């Protein structure tokens, strides 16, 4: 896939992603906070199209992500993130995708996700999270 | 289980844990680094005996944990940490315990585990890790 890395910002305002119940997570774009103003992240797009887009709009700054989880599984020969769920202090967003495979999660007791990096080919191959106080 | 919380330090020099090949993780203790001196964390003891001790002595500072992984699952009807694996830039310690149930994993691309907290009854019930640059 194509590797991406947004780097680190002040916080997260919105998450735009897309998925397909036939397959996996496809695209990913984050609207960050950068010192109390919106910074529109790069839009990381699958090599293919067909996904259903979802906008998670968080009530920033009072709402923030406390856990990210998901499932990874084989889709037509690619091992990919098939499902994501974002749990905030306010509510749960997802699951988006297919909830089948090996689970993963990052729960956070103290600290903020302040960025994402990863790789997207046909689907979201994998991703990492910058964390900060 | 009884709660423990070592707090945060400069680094990790050694981990002393015990485990049982039919059950779960039992005792857990850390020798941290604090500003250059070994800081001998309290031994967090299982309420039961019969475990196998292991000493993971790291070549601190050049050697450090890059991933902590494991499995959580039922033992005697409690969800517990049934196994742990510590992977450093120099090698892999484990799995210790029983590799069954739901896997979990924290790989680190940047930063260090500088503390543990959690809870031990008959077995390690849960744990968290403090991260720092």
């Amino acid at each position: 896939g194509k590797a991406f890395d947004d780097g680190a910002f002040t916080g997260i305002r919105e998450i735009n992603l897309s998925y397909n119940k036939e397959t996996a997570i496809g695209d990913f774009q984050v609207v960050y906070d950068l010192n109390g103003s919106p910074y529109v992240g790069q839009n990381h797009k699958s090599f293919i199209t067909g996904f259903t887009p979802v906008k998670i709009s968080l009530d920033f700054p009072s709402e923030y992500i406390m856990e990210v989880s998901g499932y990874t599984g084989n889709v037509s020969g690619y091992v990919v993130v098939r499902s994501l769920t974002f749990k905030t202090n306010k509510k749960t967003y997802g699951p988006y995708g297919v909830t089948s495979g090996t689970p993963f999660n990052l729960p956070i007791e103290n600290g903020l996700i302040v960025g994402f990096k990863g790789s997207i080919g046909y689907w979201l191959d994998y991703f990492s999270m910058y964390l900060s106080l | 289980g009884k709660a423990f919380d070592d707090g945060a330090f400069t680094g990790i020099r050694e981990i002393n844990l015990s485990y049982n090949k039919e059950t779960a993780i039992g005792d857990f203790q850390v020798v941290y680094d604090l500003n250059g001196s070994p800081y001998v964390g309290q031994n967090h003891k299982s309420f039961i005996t019969g475990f196998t001790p292991v000493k993971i002595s790291l070549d601190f500072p050049s050697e450090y944990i890059m991933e902590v992984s494991g499995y959580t699952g039922n033992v005697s009807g409690y969800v517990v940490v049934r196994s742990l694996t510590f992977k450093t830039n120099k090698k892999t310690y484990g799995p210790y315990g029983v590799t069954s149930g739901t896997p979990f994993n924290l790989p680190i691309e940047n930063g260090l585990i500088v503390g543990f907290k959690g809870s031990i009854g008959y077995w390690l019930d849960y744990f968290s890790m403090y991260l720092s640059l």
Binding site: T72, Y126 | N105, L106, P107, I108, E109, N110, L133
Partner: peptide
């Protein structure tokens, strides 16, 4: 050192 600020990063998952 570099003039590039650092931050904790965890993962990847996938």
């Amino acid at each position: 050192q570099s003039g590039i600020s650092q931050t904790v990063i965890v993962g990847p998952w996938g």
